[PDB]
Design a protein around this ligand. Sequence first.
Ligand SMILES: COc1ccc(C[C@H]2NC[C@H](O)[C@H]2OC(C)=O)cc1
Ligand SMILES: [Mg+2]
Ligand SMILES: [Mg+2]
Ligand SMILES: [Mg+2]
Ligand SMILES: [Mg+2]
Ligand SMILES: [Mg+2]
Ligand SMILES: [Mg+2]
Ligand SMILES: [Mg+2]
Ligand SMILES: [Mg+2]
Ligand SMILES: [Mg+2]
Ligand SMILES: [Mg+2]
Ligand SMILES: [Mg+2]
Ligand SMILES: [Mg+2]
Ligand SMILES: [Mg+2]
Ligand SMILES: [Mg+2]
Ligand SMILES: [Mg+2]
Ligand SMILES: [Mg+2]
Ligand SMILES: [Mg+2]
Ligand SMILES: [Mg+2]
Ligand SMILES: [Mg+2]
Ligand SMILES: [Mg+2]
Ligand SMILES: [Mg+2]
Ligand SMILES: [Mg+2]
Ligand SMILES: [Mg+2]
Ligand SMILES: [Mg+2]
Ligand SMILES: [Mg+2]
Ligand SMILES: [Mg+2]
Ligand SMILES: [Mg+2]
Ligand SMILES: [Mg+2]
Ligand SMILES: [Mg+2]
Ligand SMILES: [Mg+2]
Ligand SMILES: [Mg+2]
Ligand SMILES: [Mg+2]
Ligand SMILES: [Mg+2]
Ligand SMILES: [Mg+2]
Ligand SMILES: [Mg+2]
Ligand SMILES: [Mg+2]
Ligand SMILES: [Mg+2]
Ligand SMILES: [Mg+2]
Ligand SMILES: [Mg+2]
Ligand SMILES: [Mg+2]
Ligand SMILES: [Mg+2]
Ligand SMILES: [Mg+2]
Ligand SMILES: [Mg+2]
Ligand SMILES: [Mg+2]
Ligand SMILES: [Mg+2]
Ligand SMILES: [Mg+2]
Ligand SMILES: [Mg+2]
Ligand SMILES: [Mg+2]
Ligand SMILES: [Mg+2]
Ligand SMILES: [Mg+2]
Ligand SMILES: [Mg+2]
Ligand SMILES: [Mg+2]
Ligand SMILES: [Mg+2]
Ligand SMILES: [Mg+2]
Ligand SMILES: [Mg+2]
Ligand SMILES: [Mg+2]
Ligand SMILES: [Mg+2]
Ligand SMILES: [Mg+2]
Ligand SMILES: [Mg+2]
Ligand SMILES: [Mg+2]
Ligand SMILES: [Mg+2]
Ligand SMILES: [Mg+2]
Lengths: 48, 96, 136, 98, 177
Amino acid sequence: AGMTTIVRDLDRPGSKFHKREVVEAVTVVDTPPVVVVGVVGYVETPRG
Amino acid sequence: ANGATSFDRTKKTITPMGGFVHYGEIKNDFIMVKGCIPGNRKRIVTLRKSLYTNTSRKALEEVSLKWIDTASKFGKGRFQTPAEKHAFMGTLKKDL
Amino acid sequence: SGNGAQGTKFRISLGLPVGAIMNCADNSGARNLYIIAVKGSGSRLNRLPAASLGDMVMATVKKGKPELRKKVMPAIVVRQAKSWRRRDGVFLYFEDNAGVIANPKGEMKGSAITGPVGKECADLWPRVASNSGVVV
Amino acid sequence: MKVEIDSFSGAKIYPGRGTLFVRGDSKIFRFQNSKSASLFKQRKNPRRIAWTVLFRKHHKKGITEEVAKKRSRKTVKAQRPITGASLDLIKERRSLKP
Amino acid sequence: MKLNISYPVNGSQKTFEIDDEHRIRVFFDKRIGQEVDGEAVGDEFKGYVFKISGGNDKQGFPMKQGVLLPTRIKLLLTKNVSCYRPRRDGERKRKSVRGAIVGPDLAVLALVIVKKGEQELEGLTDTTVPKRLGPKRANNIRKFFGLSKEDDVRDFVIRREVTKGEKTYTKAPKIQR
RNA sequence: UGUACAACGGGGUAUUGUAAGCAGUAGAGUAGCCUUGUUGUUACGAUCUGCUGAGAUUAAGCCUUUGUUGUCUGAUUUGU
RNA sequence: GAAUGUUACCGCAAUAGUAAUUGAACUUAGUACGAGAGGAACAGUUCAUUCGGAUAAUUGGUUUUUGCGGCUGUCUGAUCAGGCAUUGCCGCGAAGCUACCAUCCGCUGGAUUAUGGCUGAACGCCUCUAAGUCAGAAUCCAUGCUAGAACGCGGUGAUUUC
RNA sequence: GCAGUCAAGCGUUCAUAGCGACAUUGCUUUUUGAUUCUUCGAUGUCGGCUCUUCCUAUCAUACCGAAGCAGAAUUCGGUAA
RNA sequence: GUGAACAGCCUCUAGUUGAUAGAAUAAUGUAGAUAAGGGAAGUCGGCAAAAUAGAUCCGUAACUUCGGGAUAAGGAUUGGC
RNA sequence: GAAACUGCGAAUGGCUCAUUAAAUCAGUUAUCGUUUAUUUGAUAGUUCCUUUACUACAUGGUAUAACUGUGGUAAUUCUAGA
Ligand SMILES: COc1ccc(C[C@H]2NC[C@H](O)[C@H]2OC(C)=O)cc1
Ligand SMILES: [Mg+2]
Ligand SMILES: [Mg+2]
Ligand SMILES: [Mg+2]
Ligand SMILES: [Mg+2]
Ligand SMILES: [Mg+2]
Ligand SMILES: [Mg+2]
Ligand SMILES: [Mg+2]
Ligand SMILES: [Mg+2]
Ligand SMILES: [Mg+2]
Ligand SMILES: [Mg+2]
Ligand SMILES: [Mg+2]
Ligand SMILES: [Mg+2]
Ligand SMILES: [Mg+2]
Ligand SMILES: [Mg+2]
Ligand SMILES: [Mg+2]
Ligand SMILES: [Mg+2]
Ligand SMILES: [Mg+2]
Ligand SMILES: [Mg+2]
Ligand SMILES: [Mg+2]
Ligand SMILES: [Mg+2]
Ligand SMILES: [Mg+2]
Ligand SMILES: [Mg+2]
Ligand SMILES: [Mg+2]
Ligand SMILES: [Mg+2]
Ligand SMILES: [Mg+2]
Ligand SMILES: [Mg+2]
Ligand SMILES: [Mg+2]
Ligand SMILES: [Mg+2]
Ligand SMILES: [Mg+2]
Ligand SMILES: [Mg+2]
Ligand SMILES: [Mg+2]
Ligand SMILES: [Mg+2]
Ligand SMILES: [Mg+2]
Ligand SMILES: [Mg+2]
Ligand SMILES: [Mg+2]
Ligand SMILES: [Mg+2]
Ligand SMILES: [Mg+2]
Ligand SMILES: [Mg+2]
Ligand SMILES: [Mg+2]
Ligand SMILES: [Mg+2]
Ligand SMILES: [Mg+2]
Ligand SMILES: [Mg+2]
Ligand SMILES: [Mg+2]
Ligand SMILES: [Mg+2]
Ligand SMILES: [Mg+2]
Ligand SMILES: [Mg+2]
Ligand SMILES: [Mg+2]
Ligand SMILES: [Mg+2]
Ligand SMILES: [Mg+2]
Ligand SMILES: [Mg+2]
Ligand SMILES: [Mg+2]
Ligand SMILES: [Mg+2]
Ligand SMILES: [Mg+2]
Ligand SMILES: [Mg+2]
Ligand SMILES: [Mg+2]
Ligand SMILES: [Mg+2]
Ligand SMILES: [Mg+2]
Ligand SMILES: [Mg+2]
Ligand SMILES: [Mg+2]
Ligand SMILES: [Mg+2]
Ligand SMILES: [Mg+2]
Ligand SMILES: [Mg+2]
């Protein structure tokens, strides 16, 4: 669907931004339930 | 309150004012993933379980969002919500 | 950055390639700094080395005391003008370019620093912190 | 997370967004966008640009009932008396007569 | 951040520490003078109304009514003004000041109870410290009793007992006017 | 022939920076007629102000729609 | 893109390609070693270089959105509203494109080389080697990643009567 | 131009840690000569820019053996393009 | 008409509206423009390009054949009513 | 009699010779051309209100230090709320 921005404190002992906020890009993907309609079974062969 | 957080709280969904440019609304569940991804808006996209147990510290860090941006993307968006916009602007020549 | 650098630095937009001239912001006698190199820079066919906030550069002094001209010295970039973006999300920029002349170890020739100073540079170079007024 | 405001226009600046200019003296001017930032560089006067806060604040635009009355006036009245003096002889001599 | 709360009816005072960025958040963007309902700040204070009257940021610089701004600035102050006591006649000093709009950077908020809530606050509503001093000017006595200039004021002057170990002495002001 | 599809229209979202019209004790000021001023009168005046964050534009690769109007069998080819 | 009944969908994997790179800081540690002067490394951490593949939430650039506003000259009697000036000029400018000028991401198993070893004869002694065998590198083969043989292949759907 | 063999000498002592005379065996075809076989009814000449690939006689980077290797630094050698 | 102007730009009279056309807007072009921060580091070489420009006022160096050099250089200013 | 308010003083003193060439400075003038805390001496019967059902003069108003108490800052002759 798209992108937006995020703010969060960062947790990383050792870094100059430990316990400081950061602002970060995120994408959003639309994800309604998938529906199951079949099963397929594979077997191993010397051809793969 | 999809787009709300513990710290934000203001009931609002992830859909930016005016709605995701070139897509629409997001009325289903979603996956928000840090950063950016191959493919473009509207394209089918497969998300896959990782092939190795990464340790990284970077992986492992349990994030907790403080605030999700939600202003329009169709310009230099100034307001998170019609509510905010109503607040700041005052009364207009339309309206009640 | 490199030697005498207390700490590390997150990457910030390179603003001053070789031949850039920046205001001299200490009381050392130097009026300007001509950048001839950037310490710890890398190599790409045709790429100019370029410095940013809190970088050690090799430099010469083109306007200033005669006792300070015709010779190469170390110096440290304190103001930038080319906008960079911090990890707190902000794009920010100064109204000019400026460093102060320093010795390999990062100690400063001059006693004071005139004008504001980027935080990412105070952080790096303690002797520079010392002499600052307004940081960032 | 502070929401900032536009030095020129008076507009809310949500995190990471617009640009930040640090002037010679050390006045930190914050813009929410290149529009403010250009007018600013052009030495434009916010009070003469009609869509700005300062313009409106100045030309008294749409404060409306912000200059109206209210309901804020206390309620108390209680006798402590005066320290050292027996506050148990500060009401049975406080009987008035007018 | 600490909260310096005063009940001016009883002339009491007690402080309160509140570590809840949510319970705090009610106070931000509010200026000095504005009132605040209580429930938001704690289940204790439900019903209470608080008037915001000042405070200090971490760094200790004070709030100053009517700056607006939620940041600091350096003003030029004079006689008869808050956050400055002149050392010399005609002296003005340029000093930093914290603005009157409350923000997370405040070390302490200064609050004054205006109207009481639904339940007593520990060392505040339950204890009552008295005035220190009483009327000294003739007519002020006549009004802290309501007297009509015929009643004679020498009698209503206040009397403060005091011990000299085994002598209990008694002192009154000196009526002026 | 239906959660259809389209063209409009409406609402959101944006961009600009306050439309046209009218009005005014705003305006450097200027003329014209006398009943020659105890705001004399009738107009003209760059610009300003109010109605008015107005007007305009906004998918052409923005979002959305209980409204309006329309559309919904032509062509060719394929076989173990 | 013809032909392998037609057409559709989901897959396999032969062969070919293949990718990551280097540095610093902290810490180890003023430690080991050293009369002293000097003075390391492994484990851990934070960043960076050079390369690569994407991506456009943010910021920057681009402007025929000729979208809104402003300006010169002229033309339409004035007004409104416009035309012309090889896109007249200027400020802002969404959308798209886009930049180490912006952001995100760049996998872990095995087998080996050199070399150091085990057991061990030749040669009653000795030997890493002759037989047999352990550990091992920015190597190699896999994993992973890109293509998919248009004459390599599998599973599945529906298959025309005037 | 690059690499060997002998080992007098160098290296405080000590031929070969690192080197190495007098001699002597080679390799290489970015040197320069020697030649004149191909092109004179025409194979566009220097250098740079751009860009790909290959060689290894390896400068860096990985793992090693050695030292006249205490540490630090360095030098010599192997597997390595 | 603007303007110093037979300039450029717009107009009246007259004269044209001729010059294959349609649909799209990939690469690479030809011609026209813009670009953050830096500022010749590019290159044989600032090639190309950019900058400057009218008028009024102020100000103007070396040197000189005293005629110049000179719009030297450097500055302010300019609409409408 | 601490603290504090109020008043007065801190414009004297002490120091130095940087600037300064008709400036300063000197001797001599002027104020019929001005301001002057102070010291000294003089100096004030009038204050109200259309001037009989009258105005606190036997004397009109609060708001502040010190203080009490709640506090902030690493830090100063910092100071906030009550
Ligand atoms: C000394 O530099 C040069 C000498 C000779 C040539 C030409 C020859 N090259 C090959 C043939 O013999 C002739 O080719 C042609 C095309 O004429 C070029 C450069
Ligand atoms: Mg946008
Ligand atoms: Mg200076
Ligand atoms: Mg080059
Ligand atoms: Mg010179
Ligand atoms: Mg110092
Ligand atoms: Mg711009
Ligand atoms: Mg832009
Ligand atoms: Mg008295
Ligand atoms: Mg239709
Ligand atoms: Mg308006
Ligand atoms: Mg297209
Ligand atoms: Mg409708
Ligand atoms: Mg076929
Ligand atoms: Mg140490
Ligand atoms: Mg020794
Ligand atoms: Mg853009
Ligand atoms: Mg226009
Ligand atoms: Mg009109
Ligand atoms: Mg025409
Ligand atoms: Mg023409
Ligand atoms: Mg990259
Ligand atoms: Mg794997
Ligand atoms: Mg294998
Ligand atoms: Mg053994
Ligand atoms: Mg072996
Ligand atoms: Mg073997
Ligand atoms: Mg053998
Ligand atoms: Mg590898
Ligand atoms: Mg991979
Ligand atoms: Mg195939
Ligand atoms: Mg098949
Ligand atoms: Mg010999
Ligand atoms: Mg030896
Ligand atoms: Mg010897
Ligand atoms: Mg050679
Ligand atoms: Mg021949
Ligand atoms: Mg020949
Ligand atoms: Mg020839
Ligand atoms: Mg030939
Ligand atoms: Mg050829
Ligand atoms: Mg080899
Ligand atoms: Mg030895
Ligand atoms: Mg080896
Ligand atoms: Mg290679
Ligand atoms: Mg190879
Ligand atoms: Mg090879
Ligand atoms: Mg003719
Ligand atoms: Mg032709
Ligand atoms: Mg054509
Ligand atoms: Mg540029
Ligand atoms: Mg320049
Ligand atoms: Mg050059
Ligand atoms: Mg130059
Ligand atoms: Mg060059
Ligand atoms: Mg040349
Ligand atoms: Mg040259
Ligand atoms: Mg040229
Ligand atoms: Mg330009
Ligand atoms: Mg000249
Ligand atoms: Mg004028
Ligand atoms: Mg004196
Ligand atoms: Mg008062």
